[PDB]
Amino acid sequence: KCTKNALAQTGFNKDKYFNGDVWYVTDYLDLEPDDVPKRYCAALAAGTASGKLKEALYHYDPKTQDTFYDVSELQEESPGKYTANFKKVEKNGNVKVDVTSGNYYTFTVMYADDSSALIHTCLHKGNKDLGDLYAVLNRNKDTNAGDKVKGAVTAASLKFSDFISTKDNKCEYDNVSLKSLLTK
Ligand code: HEM
Numbered sequence: 362k363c364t365k366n367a368l369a370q371t372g373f374n375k376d377k378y379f380n381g382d383v384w385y386v387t388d389y390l391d392l393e394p395d396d397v398p399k400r401y402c403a404a405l406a407a408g409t410a411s412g413k414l415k416e417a418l419y420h421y422d423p424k425t426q427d428t429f430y431d432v433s434e435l436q437e438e439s440p441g442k443y444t445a446n447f448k449k450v451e452k453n454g455n456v457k458v459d460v461t462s463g464n465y466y467t468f469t470v471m472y473a474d475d476s477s478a479l480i481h482t483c484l485h486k487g488n489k490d491l492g493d494l495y496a497v498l499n500r501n502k503d504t505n506a507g508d509k510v511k512g513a514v515t516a517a518s519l520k521f522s523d524f525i526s527t528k529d530n531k532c533e534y535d536n537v538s539l540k541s542l543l544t545k
């Protein structure tokens with residue numbers, strides 16, 4: 362089960378966050394981890410298209426080379442807090458799994474500046490909650506978490522030490538498709 366007491370950062374700037382560009386997950390903390398261990402890579406691009414907030418997602422497994430995409434229309438619950446009803450698609454936007462009622466994820470932007478951010482996400486699939494996941498994002502895939510994002514991890518009562526880095530993970534990203542899924 363997830364947490365819904367994640368606090369959106371005060372004075373969160375929507376225009377810079379949803380600029381249509383890519384965010385790399387450089388470090389993450391999964392509270393409910395699988396039995397089998399799988400180290401992932403993930404990136405996302407949040408923007409606007411046709412007048413709606415949109416977020417496209419990318420997950421890459423460096424050990425199997427398996428890759429999946431998702432596109433969702435976002436619904437703002439309160440600035441910095443959003444609900445995403447996702448659909449799994451191919452990189453060209455063809456739908457593999459349609460939008461389903463029990464399928465969504467919500468995320469809170471806990472901290473964000475021009476180059477970094479700390480978010481909380483809760484994945485819900487088939488009316489089954491799947492557990493809290495905290496992620497540190499950066500607009501550059503090689504940058505280490507700075508003092509500001511680290512203070513934000515502390516302020517949410519977490520230990521940055523428990524965070525796992527994707528830096529030495531052999532990650533490969535497909536930004537072109539990420540950005541283009543924004544309109545699908
Ligand atoms: C902001 C970052 C993330 C968001 C919003 C997010 C969202 C999601 C969504 C929507 C799915 C469902 C895919 C589908 O079936 O269509 C998913 C699945 C998955 N994600 Fe992520 N994810 C994020 C980061 C990560 C990271 C860094 C990891 C590593 C812990 C991860 C590991 C997985 C795995 C293993 C699955 C498959 C379902 C399971 O076994 O629980 N994701 N993610």
Ligand SMILES: O=P([O-])(O)O
Binds near residue numbers: 474
């Ligand atoms: O602008 P910062 O987050 O790199 O200090």
Ligand SMILES: [N+]
Binds near residue numbers: 484494
């Ligand atoms: N996840």
